[PDB]
Amino acid sequence: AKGEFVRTKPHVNVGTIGHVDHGKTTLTAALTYVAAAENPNVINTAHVEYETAKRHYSHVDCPGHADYIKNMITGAAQMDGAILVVSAADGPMPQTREHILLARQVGVPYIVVFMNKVDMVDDPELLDLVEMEVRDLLNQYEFPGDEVPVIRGSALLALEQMHRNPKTRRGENEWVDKIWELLDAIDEYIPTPVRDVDKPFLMPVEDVFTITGRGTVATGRIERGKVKVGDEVEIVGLAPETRRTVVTGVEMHRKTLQEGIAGDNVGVLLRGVSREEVERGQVLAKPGSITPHTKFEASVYVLKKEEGGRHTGFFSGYRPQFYFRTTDVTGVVQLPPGVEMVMPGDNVTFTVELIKPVALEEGLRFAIREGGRTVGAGVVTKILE
Amino acid sequence: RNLSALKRHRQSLKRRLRNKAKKSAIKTLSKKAIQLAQEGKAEEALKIMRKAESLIDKAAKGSTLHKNAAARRKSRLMRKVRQLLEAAGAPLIGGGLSA
Amino acid sequence: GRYIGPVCRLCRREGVKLYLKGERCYSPKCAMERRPYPPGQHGQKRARRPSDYAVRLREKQKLRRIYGISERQFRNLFEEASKKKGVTGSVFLGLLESRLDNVVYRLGFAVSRRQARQLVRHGHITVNGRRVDLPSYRVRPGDEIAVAEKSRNLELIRQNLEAMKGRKVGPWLSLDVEGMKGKFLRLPDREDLALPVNEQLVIEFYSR
Amino acid sequence: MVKIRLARFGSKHNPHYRIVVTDARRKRDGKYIEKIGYYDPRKTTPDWLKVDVERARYWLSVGAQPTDTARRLLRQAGVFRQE
RNA sequence: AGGGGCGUAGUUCAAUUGGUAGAGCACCGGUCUCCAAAACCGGGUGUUGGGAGUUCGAGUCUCUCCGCCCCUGCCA
RNA sequence: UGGAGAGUUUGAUCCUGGCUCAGGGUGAACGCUGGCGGCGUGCCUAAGACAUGCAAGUCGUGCGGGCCGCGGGGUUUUACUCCGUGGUCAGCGGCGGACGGGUGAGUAACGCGUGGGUGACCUACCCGGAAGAGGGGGACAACCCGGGGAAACUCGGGCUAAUCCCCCAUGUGGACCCGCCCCUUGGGGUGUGUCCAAAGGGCUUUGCCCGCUUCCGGAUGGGCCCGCGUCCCAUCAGCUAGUUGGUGGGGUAAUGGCCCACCAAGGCGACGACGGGUAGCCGGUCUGAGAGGAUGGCCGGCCACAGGGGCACUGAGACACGGGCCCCACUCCUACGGGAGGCAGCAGUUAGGAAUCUUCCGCAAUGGGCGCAAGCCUGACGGAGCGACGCCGCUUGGAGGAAGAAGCCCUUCGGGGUGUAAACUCCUGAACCCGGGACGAAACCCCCGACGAGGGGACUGACGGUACCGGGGUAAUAGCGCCGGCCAACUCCGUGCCAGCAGCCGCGGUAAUACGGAGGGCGCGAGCGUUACCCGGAUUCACUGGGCGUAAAGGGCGUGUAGGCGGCCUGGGGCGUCCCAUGUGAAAGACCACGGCUCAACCGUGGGGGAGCGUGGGAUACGCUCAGGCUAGACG
Ligand SMILES: C/C=C\C=C\[C@@H]1O[C@](O)([C@H](CC)C(=O)NC/C=C/C=C(\C)[C@@H](OC)[C@@H](C)[C@@H]2O[C@H](/C=C/C=C/C=C(\C)C(=O)c3c(O)cc[nH]c3=O)[C@H](O)[C@@H]2O)[C@H](O)[C@H](O)C1(C)C
Ligand SMILES: Nc1nc2c(ncn2[C@@H]2O[C@H](COP(=O)(O)OP(=O)(O)O)[C@@H](O)[C@H]2O)c(=O)[nH]1
Ligand SMILES: [Zn+2]
C-alpha cells in the first residue's frame, strides 16, 4: 500500500511568492487539484506537487512574513523559478516587494507573475495598470520585467469548480483555463538547469522527520551526484563531530524513489540515527567529500545603501549571520592590519570565526544578513581551521 | 490477512457438535436407566441400560470418549443400576448386567 | 604490534648489553660501549637502591625485550608455562625459544630477531615443506625449518647464510648450510641459553 | 518418532556433525538420546566418519527412522550390508 | 521553522526623569606576618549577552544574532 | 602442585581497628585515539507502543466441481461437450498448525535440582507380532438460483463425491457388572451375561505399494505423587472453613477437598507457620590455595508467559505466540449497524536509557512438516552486514649509518639529552594489480539386481570469483595512561591556599619531582584510561580460620522450659559412621593427550575425575538405642 515512483519527464523546483494574503497559498491548492484530472495519481512551507504533460513538479508554498523570512529564504535557494502572485485588488504591496528583491538575492532565475484575484472590481486600467507597476517593479530590481509571462485569472473560483466534480479537462471553465494558461505557460519560458550527477554526493538538510516504524528522514534537494539504498553518507556540520551512516530509503513526494539524482527534493531514511541527532544546516554527503569548519577567509562584497545594505561601514569585530545553504550561523569578523573603516561598497577579504561548525569548502558562496538586511555576499577563499 | 487455519475452526465447530450430541445422549440415556433401576422396572431398566452401554462404547470408537473414559462411565452405570435393582427385584431380561 | 623503535636505547636502560641489531650490536658501538648508562636527561646520575618491585619489573622487561615480544603474548606463554607440568622456569624459556621467528635467528638466516621477524612475515621461511609466515608459530621437535626456494637467491639469505661457514649452532638445532635447512632436535634448556636473565626472579614478577 | 540424524557442532565454516538417535521434535542441536557416531563432511582427517555398529542397528530394529542424508552415512559405514 | 520572556560588575540588586554606569555581601593592594584572619590606609573591580541602527550621545528606543525557558509547528 | 602484601591514628612504640591500593573478571558504557583479518558476541532499561514485508504448510496416489491451454469431434456441424492429459482457484477430507522460534513479566513453589514411586495413568507418527477389512443406507460444502450488506462476509431452496457420517454382521480380541483362582493398593488368568471394529487409493493387477480396523508388546515423549536441597526482614508470631480428616458421589487418561453433599474437629507454627521484600531454577560462569563468596548474559535442560484478564472447542497432545469466544485499555476503517489488530518470531521504528545491529543473501548444507515420489513450505538454520564489545593473529619495516646535524630541552657555559633516532645507503614488499580458483555434495531419484544387500549413473553451492595458490608490487598508522609514597619513571618555567590536583596519606600561602606547559622518562600498544558492579587481598562474620579484665564485646542475679552436651564395665540392635559392588551423576563447559584451519583464538576425537543420592553386601572402634552390671559425678 505504498507505490513506487518511475522516471521519464524532467524534474523542476518551483514555489509561489508575493505579498501575504494575496493568492499564493490557495492557487497552489488550485494548480494541484487541476493537473490531477488528465494525469492519474496526484506559518510553515508546504512542499506539495503536480505533474503536467511535459514535466514533473515540486512547488513550495512558503508562509511569507517579515517574521518568517528565514523559513522562506531557504525554500527560494532550492527552486529554479518563482510564480510571483499579485492581487488585482491591491497591487504591488510591500511584501510583494520584499519577496522579489529577496528572491533575487538568493539567486533564482526567471519569474512567472500570476495575476490572481482578477475576478473582483472590473476596471479597464486596474487589470492592465497592474501589469505595468509589476514590470516597473521587476526591472526596478533588474528582472526581465518587460517580458515575463503575465497570466491573469482568479484561483479561488478555479478551485471551487474542482470540489464540485474532480475530473475537469482543458478549458471547461472560462476559468479552469487561466490556471491551465499559467500551468501550461509555466513549463515554458522557465527552462531546466544543468544537474551534474558526476560530482560526489551532497544534499543540504531542510526539514528532518521521524517516520514511525522507520526512523529519521532527511529531506533536501540533492546538490550533486546521487544516492540509492545501501549508500554510505556523512552528516557533516553542526555537531560534536561528523556522524556516518548508510541510507536505507529514498523517496519522491511521499513515494519510493529508485536513485534520486541531483536537483530533486528527496527524503532519505538514515540508518540508525536519532532525531535530535540531525538538524538543518547539516549536509548529507559522500564519505570524505567536504569537512566541518569554523574559520575561513572569503572575497565578500558589501552592498551599498542603494541596494539595501549598511550605510556606515563596520570595523573589525562585527557579528552578522552567514547563510551557506539551508543554514544561517553567526560569526565574528577579524581581518588585515588596517582595512579598518570598511564602509559600504568594498571587496575585502576578511576572516570569519563561526561559533557553530558548518560544512565549509573552498569555492562555496554565501551571504551576510544583519539587522534584517543582506549586508553582504561572497565566497569561501582559503580555510584556516 | 488470513490463513488455512480457519479450515480447522470450521472443522472444529462441526465435530464439536458431532460428539457434543453423541455425549448428551449417553447422559440423558444413563439417567433414564437409573431413574428406573430403582423403581423396580428390572426388565426395561437393563433394556435401556443395555442401550446406554452401547452408545458409550460407540463414542469411544471416535475422538469422543476414547478408551477408559468410556470404560469408567460403564462401570459406574452397571454399578449404580445393579446396586439399585438388588434393592428388591431380581434381574429380569438378561440385559447387559452379567448374571 | 611489536616494538619498532630506538633499540640500543633498551640495550642501555636494562643494564645488560642486548643484541637487537645483530651486526652493529656486536661492534665498537652497541652504545653499551660508549654510554653504558640509561637514556634520557638523567641516566648518568646516582642510581637509588631499586625496590624489590623494580628489580623484578626490570628482570622481566629484559627477558621480554630480548625476544621483542609484546606484553600480551609474553604473559600468555608464562601463564601457559605454569599450567604445564615441570619447572615453569625452564618450560617458559623453552616455549619462548620455540618461537619460529626466533628459531630462524637462532639458525643464522637472520642477523637479528627484528630482521628474522620480517623474513618469516614476508614468506621466505618454511616448516616441513609448506611455508609459515606467523612469527609466533611454535616449532616442535623433529621439524625442519628452511628458506623458501624463491628466497634462496636473495642478497641477504646469502651473507647471513655465508657467515654460517663454521659457526656452530645450539646442541638442540642442526643446520644444512648449503640446503638452507635445520631441525629442532630438542627443546633448549636454562643452561644451553646463556641468557643474562634470572628466570625464577621473573616468575616472581607475575604474583603480586 | 525417534530418529537418527545429524546435530551440527564444530564452528562457522567448519561443520562437524554428530550422528545421533534423538527424537524427531528435539531442536537439531538439542538434548539427544544417544550419540552413535560422528561425521566430518570435509574429511580433514583420516577418520571423517565413525559409527557404532551394534548400536545403529539396535535403534533401527526398534523404530528409529534414519534421516535421508543420515542413512547415506550409516550405509557407507556398513550398517545394512547383511552379506 | 515561527510567537513571547530573560540576560548589567564576583554575587544578589539600582538610574522606566534617554545626558559614564551606582549601592551592600564580596573581593584587590598597602601597613603587618611565614601566609592569612582581624585592625587601620587606600581602591568599582563592568564583554550592560554579541554586533549593527537611529541620536549631537543609548543600559533605556529599532533591528539582527547567541544561550536558556515557555506555546505551538513538523511522516520522503 | 598450592596461599606475597602495602599506605594511613603517635613526638616515637606495640596492639586493636576501620579506610584505601596493587590482582582477576564484565552482554558494558564514557573519554582520547583507531590499520587488517579470523572466531565470538551485541536492548542489562519500558513484559512500553509499534507503519511494512515476510516467519506454516502441504497431499489430486482421499473426493466432487469451476476455469484456462490442448488430443478426437459425441451427430454427420459449435446439440445431452463423454472423457484425454498437464495445469490452476477455492471447497470437502487428511496429517502438521501443541514442534521449531521469542521472552523472563509472574513464580520462594514439588517451579527447579536430585533420587525415587505409579497395583493411580496417557503416548499421534515409528518399529515387532495376532486377526481382520462382508453387507448396506445418509448428510453438508463446492457448484446453480434467490436474498440483505460499505466491508468483513452472512441467510435460504435445491443437486452431489468420497479415506466425511450412520445402521447390521463377523469378535482374533478388547471394554463393563458379578463369581472364582493366583497375586497383592486398581495386575494377571477364567467362566456366564451385555457392549464395540474397519476405507479405498495408485499401479506394471488372484501381486504389490500407500493407507483402514481391533488387540498385544517395544520404543520415544509425557501426567501425577514422594524424601532431601533452594534468598532477605521476627521492628511479621501466631495462621487456617474446603480449613484438616472421613463416607458416598461428580470429575479426569489417572491419584487427590481437584470439585460437591453429609459427618468429625481438625490441620500448621520459633525445626520460623502467616505476612512483607526480592527473584525464573539448573548444567555452569567469575573469583578463590581452599573452604567459600558472587552470579545465572551467549550455549544446553526444565518451568512460566504470548497487549491485560477469564474461558472452552477441536485434538494423541493445547485450555493453544502468527486458532476461537468474551470483557478491558489503546491503534486504525466505517455508508456509524458493526468491523480489524497484538513483533517477548526475523528485520526495521519510536519512547525510555549511559547503551545494544541489516526492513541483507540462500534453502547449497543440517534439521522439521506434508507427499509413493517428483517436490513444496521453512526470517529454524547456513551465511553475509554493522559496532575495537571481547578473545586470538598480523602490520606500521629490516641491516647498515656520527667520539653524534639541525630543532627543542637542560647546563657547574666545558657540555649533557633526545640519539642509531633522523638524514642517507642498501634490502624485504601490508596493501593494491593480473591470472587460476575450492572443500563444504552425496544421497533422495534413475538403472542392473527383488523398488533388499551390493554395484553404476545424473542433478544440486547462498557464502563467492571468497578462501587459498601463482606471478607483479609501493616504505607504507600510533596512540593512551602515568612519573610525591604506596608504584616503574625528574628536570626547567608558569603559578603563589590562587588556579587547580586528589584512590588513601595528602599537594598549592613567591625556588611546587604532587597544580599547568615543556624537555625527558616509565608502562602498555590498536589500543589506552575512566566510571559502575562481583570475587580477591579482608583470619574484616574466623567451618577451614577471630574474639569479649582495660581496645567493640559477660546478660544485674537466681530458678528453670525447649534445646545442646554426657562417668565406668558388658551384651543385643547396626540409625549415625566406615568399607566393597552396583545404578545414577546428559551434552556442551573445565582439565589432560592428540589432531584440523599456515599459528593462535576457535574446533574435533579420545582419555580421566566426581561429591551427592537409590540398591545389595559387610564392619562395629566411636556416637546413638535397648538390656544387665558398677560407684569415682550428683543427691540422700
Ligand atoms: C539573502 C539570504 C540568503 C542567501 C543565501 C545564499 O546566497 C548565495 O550565497 C548568493 C550567491 C551570489 C549570495 O551571496 N546572496 C547575497 C546577496 C546577493 C545580492 C545580489 C545578487 C545583488 O547584486 C549586488 C542584486 C539583488 C542587485 O541588487 C539590486 C537591488 C537593489 C535594491 C535596493 C532596495 C530597494 C529599492 C528597496 O526598496 C528596499 C529593499 O529592497 C529592502 C528593504 N528596504 C528597502 O527600502 C538589483 O536588483 C541587483 O540585481 C547563493 O545563492 C547560496 O546558494 C544561498 C541561496 C544559500
Ligand atoms: N478575489 C479573489 N480572492 C481570492 C482569489 N484566490 C484566492 N482568494 C482569496 O484570498 C484570500 C487569501 O488567499 P491565499 O491563498 O491565502 O493567499 P496567500 O495565502 O496569501 O498566498 C482567501 O480568502 C482566498 O480565498 C481570487 O482569485 N480572487
Ligand atoms: Zn646494541
Coordinates of C-alpha atoms in Angstrom, one line a residue, chain C residues 33-128:
Chain C
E33 CA 80.3 0.6 24.6
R34 CA 80.1 4.4 24.9
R35 CA 77.2 5.3 27.3
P36 CA 76.6 2.2 29.4
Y37 CA 74.1 4.3 31.3
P38 CA 70.2 4.7 30.9
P39 CA 68.8 7.1 28.3
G40 CA 67.1 10.4 28.9
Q41 CA 68.2 13.6 30.6
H42 CA 69.3 11.9 33.8
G43 CA 70.6 8.3 33.1
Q44 CA 74.1 9.1 34.3
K45 CA 73.2 10.0 37.9
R46 CA 73.0 8.4 41.4
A47 CA 71.0 5.2 41.0
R48 CA 68.9 4.8 44.1
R49 CA 68.5 1.3 45.7
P50 CA 66.0 -0.5 43.4
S51 CA 62.8 -1.6 45.1
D52 CA 62.1 -5.3 45.2
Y53 CA 59.4 -4.5 42.6
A54 CA 61.7 -2.5 40.3
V55 CA 64.2 -5.4 40.3
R56 CA 61.6 -7.9 39.1
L57 CA 60.0 -5.5 36.7
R58 CA 63.4 -4.9 35.1
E59 CA 64.3 -8.5 35.0
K60 CA 61.1 -9.4 33.3
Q61 CA 61.4 -6.5 30.8
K62 CA 64.9 -7.6 30.0
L63 CA 63.8 -11.1 29.0
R64 CA 60.8 -9.9 27.0
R65 CA 62.9 -7.2 25.3
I66 CA 65.4 -9.8 24.0
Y67 CA 62.7 -11.7 22.1
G68 CA 61.0 -8.4 21.0
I69 CA 57.6 -9.9 22.1
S70 CA 54.5 -7.9 23.2
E71 CA 53.4 -8.0 26.9
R72 CA 50.2 -9.7 26.0
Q73 CA 51.8 -12.6 24.1
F74 CA 54.7 -12.7 26.6
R75 CA 52.3 -13.2 29.5
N76 CA 50.3 -15.9 27.9
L77 CA 53.4 -18.0 27.4
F78 CA 54.2 -17.6 31.0
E79 CA 50.7 -18.4 32.2
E80 CA 50.9 -21.3 29.8
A81 CA 54.2 -22.5 31.2
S82 CA 52.6 -22.6 34.7
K83 CA 49.7 -24.9 33.9
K84 CA 52.0 -27.3 32.0
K85 CA 54.0 -29.8 34.1
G86 CA 57.5 -29.1 35.1
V87 CA 59.5 -26.2 36.4
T88 CA 57.8 -23.1 35.0
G89 CA 61.3 -21.5 34.8
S90 CA 62.6 -23.8 32.1
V91 CA 59.3 -24.6 30.3
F92 CA 58.7 -20.8 29.9
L93 CA 62.2 -20.3 28.4
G94 CA 61.5 -23.4 26.2
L95 CA 58.3 -22.1 24.7
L96 CA 59.9 -18.7 24.3
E97 CA 62.7 -20.4 22.3
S98 CA 60.3 -22.5 20.2
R99 CA 59.0 -19.3 18.6
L100 CA 59.6 -19.6 14.8
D101 CA 60.8 -16.0 14.2
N102 CA 63.4 -16.7 16.9
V103 CA 64.3 -20.3 15.8
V104 CA 65.1 -18.6 12.4
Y105 CA 67.5 -16.1 14.1
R106 CA 69.0 -19.0 16.1
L107 CA 69.9 -20.8 12.9
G108 CA 71.5 -17.9 11.0
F109 CA 69.3 -16.7 8.2
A110 CA 68.7 -13.6 10.2
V111 CA 71.4 -11.4 11.9
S112 CA 68.9 -10.1 14.4
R113 CA 65.4 -11.1 15.6
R114 CA 63.8 -7.8 14.3
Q115 CA 65.1 -8.9 10.9
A116 CA 64.3 -12.6 11.5
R117 CA 60.7 -11.4 12.0
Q118 CA 60.4 -9.7 8.6
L119 CA 61.7 -12.8 7.0
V120 CA 59.1 -15.1 8.5
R121 CA 56.5 -12.4 7.9
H122 CA 57.4 -11.9 4.3
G123 CA 57.3 -15.6 3.4
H124 CA 60.9 -16.6 3.0
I125 CA 60.8 -19.4 5.6
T126 CA 59.4 -23.0 5.6
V127 CA 58.3 -25.7 8.0
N128 CA 58.4 -29.3 7.0

